[PDB]
């Protein structure tokens, strides 16, 4: 029972106004309802387009890190 509920802090609507309000709010709600897991596609990632010095620490902290983050 530990979830955030909608609160009507002020006002005492009757069942009809409550129903209208909830219907409108549900209609307003949207966006990604139950989206699939976002597909990984590292092809042509910006990090791969950079010039790295042969001894650059960013070869570890930026390039390898980006390729390995999962």
């Amino acid at each position: 029972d530990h979830e955030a509920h909608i609160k009507v802090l002020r006002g005492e609507p009757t069942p009809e106004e409550m129903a209208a309000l909830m219907a409108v709010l549900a209609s307003a709600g949207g966006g990604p309802a139950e989206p699939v897991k976002k597909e990984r596609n590292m092809w042509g990632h910006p990090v791969d387009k950079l010039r790295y010095s042969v001894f650059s620490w960013q070869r570890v902290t930026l390039l390898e890190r980006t390729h390995m983050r999962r």
């Binding site: 950079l50 790295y52 650059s56 960013q58 930026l62």
Partner: protein, 271 residues
Amino acid sequence: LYPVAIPEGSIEETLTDEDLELDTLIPDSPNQPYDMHEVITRILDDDEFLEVQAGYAGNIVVGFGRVEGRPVGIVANQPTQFAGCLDINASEKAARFIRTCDCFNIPIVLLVDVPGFLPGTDQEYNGIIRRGAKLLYAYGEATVAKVTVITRKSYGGAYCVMGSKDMGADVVVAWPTAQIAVMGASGAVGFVYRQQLKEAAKNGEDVDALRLELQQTYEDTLVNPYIAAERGYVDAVIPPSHTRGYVANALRLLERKIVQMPPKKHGNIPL
């Protein structure tokens, strides 16, 4: 790289007569120009010097040479043209030369005698700012060995442009005749002593004498290589004859600089 038999000993012990000529090269009067090819040929091997764009923007000389068999790129101010002032054409010429040398791993030696930028509405309208930033960018971007020899003058933004220590110069040396300052003594006095000059104007004193006295004091106190030397912007104030030795040592040691920039696809040099 050509094989060269380096003489042993210290720079003092290995000075040559051609090196000693540099001691007296610079004119006594700061208003009198000199040919910078004299310095270039006296520090380069066998006096050979392949000049690039000789007939263009004569106020700066760029070319190729060898120091102890190592190819090097010379960028030098030319006092005989526009008093060595940097302008749009000179900035672009030197910028692309420096970028070519950096592309192909050729170290650069700068010879500095520059009073500033060439004043002019035409320069401002043609873009001395945008197009003079190209030289700044090229020099700062270069990762090859970078040596600076200041002969007489390095003032203001021209000082920053022409191989300043904080712009990445690996070695910076100054001849005794060097003059490193924010600007010339006349403008400096006319600004830092506005208060006293206006008091003299109020009291009727000879401002045309007080100004010259203050300008002399300013020149004797600050227009010299020693303030930069104190701050560490000049690695050493050397006799002119030591120039080749210092340059050769620096280039021998700085074959492979372990330096880097942040990763990028490429730069965004002003165009």
